[PDB]
Structure 1
Amino acid sequence: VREVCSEQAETGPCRAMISRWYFDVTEGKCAPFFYGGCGGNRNNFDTEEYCMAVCG
């Protein structure tokens, strides 16, 4: 909730290129990023609508 929506997008150390969504506080909406497959944080949603459901 709210709090997790403000961490920066974190690709993490793995090598996959998984399209995920994070809430962007500057833009005021969710934006895409490539997630590596491991590590990273809570501001990482499978789809844009999910990201918006939780953060938007």
Structure 2
Amino acid sequence: SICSEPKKVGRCLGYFPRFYFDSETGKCTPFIYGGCGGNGNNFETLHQCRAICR
């Protein structure tokens, strides 16, 4: 799906706080997204992440 996709920061230098589902750990987790080229495991809200894959 998308929850199995890797965390991806991307090449851009924006500061966008987002959340991803962590594999080695098992929980939705904050990260800084750069603002371009994001993939599916990237949710604007923590509630999106949980509903989406949890």
Instruction: Tell whether the structures are fold-level matches, with TM greater than 0.5.
Output: yes
- Structure 1 stretches lacking a partner, 5+ long: none
* Distance in 1 separating the partners of 2:27 and 2:48: 12
Partner residue, 1:20: 18
Deviations 1:7-40 (A, max 9, x none): 1111111110100001112222100110000002
Identity of aligned residues (%): 52
Where is the helix percentage greater, Structure 1 or Structure 2?
1
From 31, 34, 43, the counterpart of 2:32 = 34
- Residue 22 of structure 2 aligns to which amino acid in structure 1? D
Over 2 Å off, 4+ runs: none
- Structure 2 stretches lacking a partner, 5+ long: none
The count of residues paired between Structure 1 and Structure 2 equals 54
C-alpha RMSD of the superposition? 0.9
Using structure 2 for the length normalisation, give the TM-score.
0.89
**What SS is found at the alignment partner of 1:53?**
helix
* Distance in 1 separating the partners of 2:43 and 2:7: 11
Using structure 1 for the length normalisation, give the TM-score.
0.86
